[PDB]
């Protein structure tokens, strides 16, 4: 949460997510072999319990960042950016992505300020779904 708003930690951020898929990996491997209703899954969802706020955030993250790719991908955007030349206004992002309304106003404010800003107030939306999304897509299977 805190890096993700940050543009210089993107490699920190990339890390970070890495550790997690390592994680959630050895817990897999806790699950190999469990019998339903087993004593090894009945102390994870314990564990998952006892962390259900970080699991919720991490869930909350994860989701809006792939749900950014669809947002990019639909027509609103890309009618909001009738040129295939790949740059949205600021003004136009925020009202695409309340056309699309799959996103509260609180996700929307987030992942403006995860958005670099630009001097020509127009930023790269491939950039940015090409700089999120992949590494939720790559990390967030492990979680699903």
């Known amino acids: ?5 940050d543009s210089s930690q ?5 890390e970070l997510m890495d550790l997690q898929k390592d994680m959630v990996v050895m817990l897999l491997s806790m699950l190999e072999g469990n ?3 087993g004593t090894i899954g ?14 919720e955030m991490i869930l909350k ?6 749900k950014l790719k669809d947002l ?11 040129d295939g ?8 992002f925020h009202k695409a ?7 509260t106003q609180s996700e929307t404010e987030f992942l403006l300020s995860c958005a670099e800003t630009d001097e020509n107030e127009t930023l790269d939306y491939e950039e940015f779904v090409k700089r999120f999304h992949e590494p939720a897509k790559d990390i967030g299977f492990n979680v699903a």
Do not use: A
């Not at 564990?47 to 706020?53: D, F, I």
């Not at 639909?74 to 950016?81: G, H, M, P, R, V």
């Not at 992505?97 to 996103?103: A, D, F, G, L, R």
């Open 97 to 103: 992505m309340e056309s699309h309304k799959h996103y």
């Open 72 to 82: 990019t991908s639909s027509d609103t955007f890309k009618e909001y950016d009738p």
């Open 42 to 55: 009945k102390q994870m969802v314990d564990m998952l319990v006892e962390s259900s706020n970080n699991v």
């Open 61 to 66: 993250f994860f989701d809006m960042f792939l």
């Open 85 to 92: 030349k790949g740059v949205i206004s600021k003004r136009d």
């Open 1 to 5: 949460m805190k890096l993700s708003q």
């Open 10 to 14: 993107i490699e920190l951020l990339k």
């Open 35 to 37: 019998v339903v209703n």
